[PDB]
Amino acid sequence: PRPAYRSRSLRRVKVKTPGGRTVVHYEKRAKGVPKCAVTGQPLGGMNSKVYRFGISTRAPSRPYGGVVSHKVLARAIRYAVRR
């Protein structure tokens, strides 16, 4: 409760209520977005801000989806074609 608010794990948000008061709300920071398994960069189409777990994130319409970016996928397919 209280020392769990003295740590910076949550966001201290000030808001003015309809009753005229100003109160501090403690909200969660967002979870990290999915990253590619090769370069580690965020994946397009899946990088919107999400604040709780258990939320489905629809992957892009491609083979391997939200696992690798389009650069890794296309290049790997080129190698498989020649190999």
Binding site: V38, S61, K71, L73, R75, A76, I77, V81
Partner: protein
């Protein structure tokens, strides 16, 4: 020229990535019209950027603007109707960031 009418190509980008198709038309330098028949391999007949396809070493004989059924008889003449049914399987574990820099 490698990207020419009658050439089997593997689409590398988009939803149809990894699937097989055959060039049937040439729009310009930047574009060609591919159709590996949608019943056969899963690729609809439409233009594709030539950078989004990978040519294979296998090529067939069909005239420009060849119909979809023409490509089917051509590939069965070459006995490649089964080859057009497979899909290419990448090995992502062999890729490093140097390959895509």
């Amino acid at each position: 020229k490698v990207i020419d009418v009658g050439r089997v190509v593997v689409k590398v980008l988009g939803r149809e990535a990894g699937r097989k198709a055959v060039v049937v038309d040439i729009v310009d330098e930047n574009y060609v019209v591919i159709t590996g028949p949608k019943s056969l391999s899963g690729v609809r007949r439409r233009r594709v950027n030539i950078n989004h396809i990978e040519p294979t070493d296998k090529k067939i004989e069909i005239k420009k603007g060849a119909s979809d059924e023409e490509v089917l008889k051509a590939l069965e003449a070459a006995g490649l109707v089964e080859y057009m049914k497979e899909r290419v399987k990448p090995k992502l574990f062999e890729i490093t960031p140097a390959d895509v820099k």
